[PDB]
Curated annotation (Swiss-Prot), chains A, B:
Designated name of the protein: Beta-galactosidase
Ligand binding (Mg(2+) 1): E24, H26, E69
Sequence positions that bind substrate: E69, E145, Y146, A147, H148
Positions with a binding annotation for Mg(2+) 2: N205
Active site: E69, E145
From-to range in the entire protein, with total length: 394 to 604 of 1024
Induction of synthesis: By allolactose.
Subunit: Homotetramer.
Effect of E69H: Slowly inactivates galactosidase activity by reducing the binding of magnesium. It increases binding specificity
Natural source organism: Escherichia coli (strain K12)
Sequence similarity: Belongs to the glycosyl hydrolase 2 family.
Residues engaged in binding Na(+): F209
Length: 211, 211
C-alpha cells in the first residue's frame, strides 16, 4: 500500500489503481512455505484486511491484490474470500503460484510472452494468446508485470499491444517498471552520481537489477 | 451422405468421419432464405433424419453435420436438437451463419486464418486463435474447410499445424479438398484431356474452381 496521498491524486487526476497488500516472500523455498502455513495466516490477514479498511473508499482503486511472489498457499485462498465477502465491488487478483489460481479473478502473469510458451514445471508461463483459451478458462488476462524496461530495453513492446488490441480478453498489463531505483552518491570532488546494488558495500547484492 | 460402402471402408481401415446431410442452399439471397422458412422444414428434416437412421451404427461416423452453406435458420436449430435427442453419442456441427451459432457443438469455420481476422459483417471469420477466446466462448474449434488446395497452393499450411499443436482447443481441420473435379474429354485423335467448368458448353460456369 502506498502513501495515502497517492490514492487521492489518482482519484483526482484519473488513474486506475491496483492496491496491493504488503506481502512478498519471494526468498522462501518453496515460495509458498509461509503463505501455506496457517501459523502465518494472522500476520498475512492483517496486511490484507488493514489495507482494505484504509483504501476501500478511493474510486481510483479498482482491483485488490493479495501481494507479490509468495507462491500459492491456503492463506491466499482464505484472504481472497475475505476480500470478496467484505468488498464485492472490486475484483481480487494475485499472480503467485502460476497466475491463474483459485485466488485470482484475473489471469495476471508476469513476463508471459505474446506467442512463445515457456512451459516451466508447475508454473508455466503460457503465450498470453494461448493462456486465454486453455480448456475451461474464461477469465480476463492482464499482465501484472511485462516488458521489463531494464536499461536498453522494451524490444517487442509493439507485439504486446497488437495482441491486446486484437483479443478482447487480453486487457493490457503493467510495464515493469516506472522509475530506476538508483541512489545518488558523491565522489571525492562532491559531484553526484547514480549508484545501484553493491555500491554501498552491500553484499550479497543484485547490482543493476534495481534499475 | 456418401455411397454406403464408404462408411464400411472407414470403419475397417480406420478414418474418422463427419457425416453430412444433403442440404446446401448457397445460392439463396440471403443464404438462410429457405432454412429459416418453416415450409422448408419438412424437406430439410428428411435429409437429416434419414441420414441418421441409415448411418447411426457406423463407428467411423463420429460427428453429424446439418449440411453446408445454408446460412443459419430456425430449421437448423430444430434439427440440431432432433439429432441431440435421438443420438446423444455424437456431437453435431454446422458452419452456416458464422460457424459458432447455437446449431453447432464445434466452432467449425471455413477458411478462417491462423492470425489474421476477416471481420465480415454478421459472419466474421476471426483468426482461429482469437476465436477460441472470444468472451463466453468455450467450444472446440475444428475447421470444416481450410487450406484451399486450388492449383499451386497450400502456402502457409505449416502455420495452421503449428497453431493446432500449440493450442489444445484448436483440434485441426478438413483440407479443401481431396480430389480435383476435372472431367475427361477427348480430342480429334481420341486423346484424353482434363476439362473443367465451361468445357461442355455449360454457362454460366465457374471455370477451374471445380479443381
Ligand atoms: Na483486448
Ligand atoms: Na528489479
Ligand atoms: Na490442439
Ligand atoms: Na470448388
Amino acid at each position: 500500500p502506498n502513501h495515502p496521498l497517492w490514492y487521492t491524486l489518482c482519484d483526482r487526476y484519473g488513474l486506475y489503481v491496483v492496491d496491493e497488500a504488503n506481502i512478498e516472500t519471494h526468498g522462501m523455498v518453496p515460495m509458498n512455505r509461509l503463505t501455506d502455513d496457517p501459523r502465518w495466516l494472522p500476520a498475512m490477514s492483517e496486511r490484507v484486511t488493514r489495507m482494505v479498511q484504509r483504501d476501500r473508499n478511493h474510486p481510483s482503486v479498482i482491483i485488490w491484490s493479495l501481494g507479490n511472489e509468495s507462491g500459492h498457499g491456503a492463506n491466499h485462498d482464505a484472504l481472497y474470500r475475505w476480500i470478496k465477502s467484505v468488498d464485492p465491488s472490486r475484483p481480487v487478483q494475485y499472480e503467485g503460484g502460476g497466475a491463474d489460481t483459485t485466488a485470482t479473478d484475473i489471469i495476471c502473469p508476469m513476463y508471459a510472452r505474446v506467442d512463445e510458451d515457456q512451459p516451466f514445471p508447475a508454473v508455466p508461463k503460457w503465450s498470453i494468446k494461448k493462456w486465454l483459451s486453455l480448456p475451461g478458462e474464461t477469465r480476463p488476462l492482464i499482465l501484472c508485470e511485462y516488458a521489463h524496461a531494464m536499461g536498453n530495453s522494451l524490444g517487442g513492446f509493439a507485439k504486446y499491444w497488437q495482441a491486446f488490441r486484437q483479443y478482447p480478453r487480453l486487457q493490457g498489463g503493467f510495464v515493469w517498471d516506472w522509475v530506476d531505483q538508483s541512489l545518488i552518491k558523491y565522489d571525492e570532488n562532491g559531484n553526484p552520481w547514480s549508484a545501484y546494488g553493491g555500491d554501498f558495500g552491500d553484499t550479497p547484492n543484485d547490482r543493476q537489477f534495481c534499475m
